[PDB]
Amino acid sequence: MHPALWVSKTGLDAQQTNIATISNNLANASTVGYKKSRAVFEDLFYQNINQPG
Amino acid sequence: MHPALWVSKTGLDAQQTNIATISNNLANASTVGYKKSRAVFEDLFYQNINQPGGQSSQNTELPSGLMLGAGSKVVATQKVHTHGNAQTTTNALDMMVEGDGFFQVTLPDGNIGYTRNGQFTLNGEGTLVTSGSGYPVEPEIVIPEDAISITVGTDGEVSVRVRGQQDNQVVGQLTITDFVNPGGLEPIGQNLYLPTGASGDPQEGVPGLDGLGEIRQSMLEASNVNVTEELVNMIEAQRVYEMNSKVISSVDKMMSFVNQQL
Amino acid sequence: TLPDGNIGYTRNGQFTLNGEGTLVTSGSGYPVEPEIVIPEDAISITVGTDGEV
Amino acid sequence: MHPALWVSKTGLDAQQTNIATISNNLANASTVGYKKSRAVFEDLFYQNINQPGGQSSQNTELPSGLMLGAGSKVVATQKVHTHGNAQTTTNALDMMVEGDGFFQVTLPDGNIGYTRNGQFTLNGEGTLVTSGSGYPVEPEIVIPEDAISITVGTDGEVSVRVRGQQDNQVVGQLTITDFVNPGGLEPIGQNLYLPTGASGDPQEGVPGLDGLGEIRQSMLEASNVNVTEELVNMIEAQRVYEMNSKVISSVDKMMSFVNQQL
Amino acid sequence: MHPALWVSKTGLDAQQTNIATISNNLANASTVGYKKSRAVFEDLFYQNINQPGGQSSQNTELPSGLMLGAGSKVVATQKVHTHGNAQTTTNALDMMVEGDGFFQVTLPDGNIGYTRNGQFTLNGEGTLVTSGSGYPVEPEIVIPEDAISITVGTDGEVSVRVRGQQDNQVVGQLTITDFVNPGGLEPIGQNLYLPTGASGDPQEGVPGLDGLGEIRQSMLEASNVNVTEELVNMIEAQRVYEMNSKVISSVDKMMSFVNQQL
């Protein structure tokens, strides 16, 4: 319905996956030979309304 | 139908673009090497009914004319390329440019993409690639299989420690590209930009000379967004969006009254 | 001061300045009697209760 | 949209600048030779509605004029260049300046950077370099491979004792740089400073003579941060921060009320 | 169109200015030497329908006439020049005026700006300047590079101590200016005031004689804003603002009803 609704949906989804990754590392704080994981964030594509240049 | 209907409709569309910009800045509040954006508002043309300065009789001129504006729009989205905070990490493959300059990656189509994100890693062949889609970082930095440590100097010189051998071996050189106007770079997503006509010619050089920034190993550049400004701008944008709806509602009620009366 | 030369009397107080700085009417641009010339080095204008500019 | 919205935005931004300054001081609570910083506030311009002293009627002038402020901002971040406490260590290569003066090191680009940090070491060639990025100290001080003990005098004279020779063999001399206004120096990170136009011309000389401090061997200068003052300042700056947010909250509720009613 | 519409517009205008004044005070809740401001309200002219005291019949006069008001406005912004609390600092170049008086600094245009701020520093030449924009202080106080400590007396006598010399070297004498009506000064921002017609003639002299205050070294003057008072005035202003919005809303509904019926 609105561009900001979809943009913020991706932000909510991205942080859910990041929080899920952090919560997994806390769960495996006693698992022998465990390697922690970090979520890598990137921005999505950009809508080209006016060309910068 | 009514001039106020068109003028206010432009104001509604302008605020929506501004809100869409605010949402993206808050969405990328944790993206490494992300630059916030600001919407630039400007008014449209002015309808000239009475000319300001036209002579109203002799020795007398119109000090102010009847000029009606056509509304407003968001003419540009400015990338505020101010340096973000530095994240102190223990990883040895995530580097940060301190100052001006961009990293260079190899796009699948063959062009060079520019990224402020420094989260790098290795692929199966040992080439230093990005931590996203895995694009190689230019110039190629192939880590030998005999290395036990990786060091990246301030001037971008990358060295390793081969087992047994002393006098750490140099494996390559990092070169960062600078642009006179980094705000003119076209964002193509994936923390990547492309050079444009307004960005300027790509100025490649050693990271630390000729006005370039320095490579900081085991460091990352957080996004420069200010959550305080984003939320307050959302407050103002929401109200002005509601302000323009009141005019359209008033015009709608005015035209309804005229239809019933006239 | 009307264009013909006679003096017209107005209750409207919306005034402004012309190119030369004389106080004029915000509409057709007729000067105000007596002429009030605002110098270009001024930073603010204060009109007194008894009309002193 | 509302004047109180913009003024409170300046209040929020200034307090964030102040808290960011205090947070920086608390982060560097164990850095050697670190000078704490304080944020300097100043009010912005005042909108001139009614001129104070304007001739409102003859023989009478406006005592107090209607002038509305535009908020406030942090105009500068002043470095408090007061001497810190001395730490006693068994290391022979860490020195301290007792008084005014800065150690000079060779930056990678070729310029001279000034540091109060005395944690020095040796590289493979025996030159006295910093224990950080390894920048050599100006002038070069090279320790011969036959030295068994290193001593640095009050006047900065570096001498070593060689196995098979009475009396120390001088290997170099240390010179420290002072500035008329050290608060004008540019912080370039890594406990280094660079001179600016407001700092003044560098002035070298032997340590101990002509106002310059004395080189104290086996001693380090702690950061001059007082965490007790830093913690209290954060509490005060947090309260002022919430003072301006209530004004934004009040203004937003005001604009919402007018939309619903008017 | 309706008298109650125009009267409440003046009420809304006054409360918007009142809130903006409060928002400026809360923004400058940490500024050094800031004097709080209070808006002064006065009613507008009264329309004379029935003259009070007019003779209705002989030996009888109107005890009270029908006089309709035109609303209210904010006539002045009064700077409350009450003394603020003192901040104890370890800096030696920050001063305070214990009592009446203003520090005088040389503005770039050539005139003298009067400041209650005491945060001073040094330029490249050693001249005592403001810690903000860097304006020189009148009269110029130049600290020679032969000094090891700066002491500023109560009477404003600036003296420095020379190394190898058991005698204070007097290098200046600060003079402060008092105004009969400091509230009549024109605030120009940057913690600076300019004299006005209603401010009075500047009277300059030694800081401590003829009613002038005393110079306090290593001490700063806090702002005199009362956050408790500003917030309560913020709540009161928000309600009075909403009071006049209801009157406009009621008038708006009244006219709409008349349009549909009449």
Key terms for this structure?
part of a larger assembly; 5 chains; about 55 residues; mainly alpha; 1 helix; about 45% helix; about 0% strand; elongated
Write a brief structural summary.
Chain A is mostly helical and 53 residues long.
Number of helices of chain A: 1
Along the chain, the helix and strand elements of chain A come as H
Class by SSE composition of chain A: mainly alpha
CA-based gyration radius of chain A? 17 Å
Helix content of chain A: 40-55%
Based on the structure, what is the oligomeric state of the protein chains?
A: part of a larger assembly
What's the overall geometry of chain A?
elongated
The CA-CA distance between the termini of chain A, in Å, is 30 Å
Largest interface (CB < 8 Å): D-E, 69 and 69 residues
Into which percentage range does the β-strand content of chain A fall? under 5%
Strand count, sense and closure of the main sheet of chain A? none
Tally of strands of chain A: 0
